[PDB]
């Protein structure tokens, strides 16, 4: 039965940088900001 588990996952959304946990999906795509990440320059806001 379910006895031994390597905590595969505790949340549907986890940051692949700091391994954070959020309740909502967006909260994740938004937080990622704090991190630079490997992405090219996009359409600046304004």
Q: Which residues bind Zn ion (CB under 5 A)?
A: 15, 17-18, 20
Q: How far apart are CA 26 and CA 20, in angstroms?
A: 13
**Measured from the CB of residue 38, what is the shortest distance to Zn ion in angstroms?**
14
**Rounded Cα distance, 18 and 34, in Å:** 10
Q: How far is the CB of 16 from Zn ion (least distance, A)?
A: 8
- d(CA 13, CA 23) in angstroms, rounded, equals 7
Closest separation in Å from C-beta 19 to Zn ion: 7
* Closest to Zn ion by CB, 19 or 44: 19
């Amino acid at each position: 039965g379910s006895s031994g588990s390597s905590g595969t996952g505790e949340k549907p959304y986890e940051c692949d940088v700091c391994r954070k946990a959020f309740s909502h999906h967006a909260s994740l795509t938004q937080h990622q900001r704090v991190h630079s990440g490997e992405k090219p320059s996009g359409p600046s806001s304004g």
